């Protein structure tokens, strides 16, 4: 009957680049989901396969809280059956996804006046990610027949590009913090 460390995920001072998303495993605790829903500090809070209002009266064997930073534009891709450089090359939800997706603007916290290039995304990949795949490889992408061998140049490009975040970016180009809750043998997470 210990409470779940949702604060440690949502209120974390450092979030991760979406290519190397973080996954907090949640077990052996009670979680009040309506407490999040009624925060009302979220711009996206869209649940697939379940009701937000009906979440508290439920149990699951394990809960996963995946969290990262993308840009306004791209939040629409954190949902099932989606295409794009995020959905395809960084973070993919399965079609039978049955959790919730939560997001809020983080310009005040995640953008710098000089430009904040710490957050990154993967731009070049030969094929899509399987759902909940995590690709951290920084091998030089090979765009042509002759092989790169770790030397950039023509047809040989670094696969990761950087979000430049500036507070003066337009809304869609600003950083959003995203937490995906996946709902998954005896149980350990209830309300």
């Amino acid at each position: 009957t210990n409470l779940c460390p949702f604060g440690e995920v949502f209120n974390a001072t450092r979030f991760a680049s979406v290519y190397a998303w973080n996954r907090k495993r949640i077990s052996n605790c009670v979680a009040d989901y309506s407490v999040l829903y009624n925060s009302a500090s979220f711009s996206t809070f869209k649940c697939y396969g379940v009701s937000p209002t009906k979440l508290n009266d439920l149990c699951f064997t394990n809960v996963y809280a995946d969290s990262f930073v993308i840009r306004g534009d791209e939040v629409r891709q954190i949902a099932p059956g989606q295409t794009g450089k995020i959905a395809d090359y960084n973070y993919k939800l399965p079609d039978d996804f049955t959790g919730c997706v939560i997001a809020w603007n983080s310009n005040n916290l995640d953008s710098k006046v000089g430009g904040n290039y710490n957050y990154l995304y993967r731009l070049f990949r030969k094929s899509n990610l399987k759902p909940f795949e995590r690709d951290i490889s920084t091998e030089i992408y090979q765009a042509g027949s002759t092989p790169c061998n770790g030397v950039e140049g023509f047809n040989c490009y670094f696969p990761l590009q950087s979000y430049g975040f500036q507070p003066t970016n337009g809304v869609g180009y600003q950083p959003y913090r995203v937490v995906v809750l996946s709902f998954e043998a005896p149980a350990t997470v209830c309300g």
């Epitope: 295409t83 794009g84 990949r125 030969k126 094929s127 899509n128 027949s145 490009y157 590009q161 970016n169």
Partner: antibody
Framework: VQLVESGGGLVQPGGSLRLSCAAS????????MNWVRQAPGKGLEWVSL???????YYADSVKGRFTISRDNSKNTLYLQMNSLRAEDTAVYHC???????????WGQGTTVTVSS | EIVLTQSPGTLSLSPGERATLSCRAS???????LAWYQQKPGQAPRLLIY???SRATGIPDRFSGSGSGTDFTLTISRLEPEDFAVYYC????????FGQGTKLEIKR
Amino acid sequence: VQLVESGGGLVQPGGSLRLSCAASGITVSSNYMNWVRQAPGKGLEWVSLIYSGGSTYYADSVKGRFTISRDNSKNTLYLQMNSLRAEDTAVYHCARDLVVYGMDVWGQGTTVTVSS
Amino acid sequence: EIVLTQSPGTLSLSPGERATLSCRASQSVSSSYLAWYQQKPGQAPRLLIYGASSRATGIPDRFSGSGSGTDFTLTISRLEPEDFAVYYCQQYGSSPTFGQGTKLEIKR
């Protein structure tokens, strides 16, 4: 390093046509790939985009009528054009897209003509 | 969506002078995506600038990209005869869009 369009010719309105883009020096299945057309005396209009991983995107003007594909074994990008209208009359180019580094390789085009 | 408007429609000058072509986006826009292309009669476009300021390889020192936010600017410091073509700018949303082109013509 080349992109060589074929397939272009004369078509009746409502007909169809498949443009080919034989590539060499870049392998098509490993890149973002674009069809850009130019109508007589007019500008560049992006028309269709295909991801390395297979996702596709189209301009509203051709949505539902055009489909972009490829053939890894022939290193050839295709564009299938159905339900052709008088306005799809143009010179069609394939480019390779590096998104952040521009479209750095282009074809000289194939000319499509649509009329009755 | 993004709508790029290029000004002027036609720029007229003579060899040696400095051309300043302008690209205006309908909303605030990422500078990582703003390419400039050159097109000479009967020819496929040529990439001159990527990012917003980077010269593609093979592009001479005269060409130079600037701008951010919504206003971008291609500059040719000392025009040469071969520089009199049409010039297009480009941005990226979920897909490419282009400007309507600026004509570079010889003043007379």
